[PDB]
Design a protein around this ligand. Sequence first.
Ligand SMILES: Cn1nc(-c2cccs2)cc1N
Length: 284
Amino acid sequence: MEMEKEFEQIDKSGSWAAIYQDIRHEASDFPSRVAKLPKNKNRNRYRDVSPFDHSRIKLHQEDNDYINASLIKMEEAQRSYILTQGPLPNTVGHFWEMVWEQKSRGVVMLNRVMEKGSLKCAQYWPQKEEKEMIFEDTNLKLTLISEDIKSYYTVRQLELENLTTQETREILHFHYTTWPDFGVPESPASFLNFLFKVRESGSLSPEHGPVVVHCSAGIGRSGTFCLADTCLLLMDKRKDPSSVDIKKVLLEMRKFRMGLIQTADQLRFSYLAVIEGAKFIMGD
Ligand SMILES: Cn1nc(-c2cccs2)cc1N
């Protein structure tokens, strides 16, 4: 079926939970043996969220190459993404090592450091220009260059230096600051505006390594971001945009990381975002 009318048909019939459970039943199951080794327990935020072995990102280190991160490679859309958990106190250095080694331009953050009165990820970037951060375990230096605070999101320019070679690179940090503590946003308008700002920066384009995207577990909000982006790109590429099937795209993405889209409300929100976003692209 088309998307917008499949949407009204699920709303009127109140069957979002049943649609979402079908997806969960059909989703791929692949081994994640490296994630579950005992030496990696303090590298995982949640015991039930792990990268598959076949698609995990490897750190370029011979001691321990493990990070909780997956490469989502979308062949028809010609887009790639790295989805990862919010960094932990003992993985902030690994996180920036990955950004460096994979040649990423942008980092997309969809959570606040504290939500619901608890810590959802480490404070992994510097908050003042004159107070830079040094990660001694991976030999990197990170400096805040500039910061632009808007009503729904903040963009930061960061300088990452590889202290071993003295090479430097500019990284863009896109921080969506207004996702609610419970539920999903009422309107997708600010999320779509944010997605378009990431796109306009070059961070999603083939001349760079894959964008790094995260929330707390790296599957829920993060899944919503890449699902909406890929669906809108396919609608631009194809002769028949109504042929884009969001449930099929989501199942393709779940071949590469488990659990993408965590609730039936996130699924409904993803439909809403793609539907509204397709009107703004055109041709309007
Ligand atoms: C002056 N300047 N500007 C930068 C960055 C630009 C864009 C991202 S980071 C780094 C330095 N040293």
